[PDB]
Amino acid sequence: SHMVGLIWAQATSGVIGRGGDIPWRLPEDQAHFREITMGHTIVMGRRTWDSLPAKVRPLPGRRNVVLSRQADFMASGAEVVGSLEEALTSPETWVIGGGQVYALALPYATRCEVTEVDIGLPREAGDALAPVLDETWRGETGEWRFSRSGLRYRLYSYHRS
Ligand SMILES: Nc1ncnc2c1ncn2[C@@H]1O[C@H](COP(=O)(O)OP(=O)(O)O)[C@@H](O)[C@H]1OP(=O)(O)O
Numbered sequence: 001s002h003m004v005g006l007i008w009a010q011a012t013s014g015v016i017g018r019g020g021d022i023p024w025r026l027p028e029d030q031a032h033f034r035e036i037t038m039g040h041t042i043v044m045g046r047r048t049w050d051s052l053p054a055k056v057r058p059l060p061g062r063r064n065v066v067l068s069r070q071a072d073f074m075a076s077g078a079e080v081v082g083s084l085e086e087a088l089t090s091p092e093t094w095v096i097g098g099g100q101v102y103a104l105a106l107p108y109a110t111r112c113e114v115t116e117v118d119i120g121l122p123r124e125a126g127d128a129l130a131p132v133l134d135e136t137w138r139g140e141t142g143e144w145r146f147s148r149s150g151l152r153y154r155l156y157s158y159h160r161s
Pocket residue numbers: 044045046047048049067068069070073082083084097098099100101102104
């Protein structure tokens with residue numbers, strides 16, 4: 001067990017998901033997600049696993065871990081753990097969602113890698129929302145850049161002891 005990180009992409013408001021979908025199209029965030037997580041362990045909740053397309057899961061080049069209370073759960077190509085702490089035995093672990101897993105994982109986390117999408121989506125009932133940090137987290141909020149489509153985004157890299 002070692003470094004636990006959270007990785008997510010949010011609208012400025014904190015929305016990460018609405019209606020079961022990512023609320024924007026941003027291939028550069030796909031590339032950023034891949035570059036942060038490749039070669040490491042990724043942890044997701046069972047509902048997140050179930051949402052992925054059958055031919056996309058497990059995400060290649062990473063040790064995929066699915067958290068579930070169901071010992072019989074089938075997650076072909078991944079491992080299933082029944083507690084989060086077991087999900088963090090790896091030397092470097094990125095939690096990728098969803099909200100229940102972020103909330104369990106936040107107390108272990110010492111790094112967050114965030115993509116802020118410049119899009120105005122005030123929160124609505126039902127939205128999936130980003131984890132909330134505080135003034136004990138510190139680090140770099142990067143400059144805005146345009147994606148190829150013109151959607152603007154910037155990157156946060158935060159840490160704590
Ligand atoms: N404390 C816990 N221990 C074990 N599994 C847990 C857990 N909290 C959440 N989970 C699992 O993680 C699932 C939630 O996945 P998620 O975090 O991707 O969902 P959501 O996106 O809806 O927040 C839960 O339904 C549960 O899986 P099962 O329903 O298969 O048991």
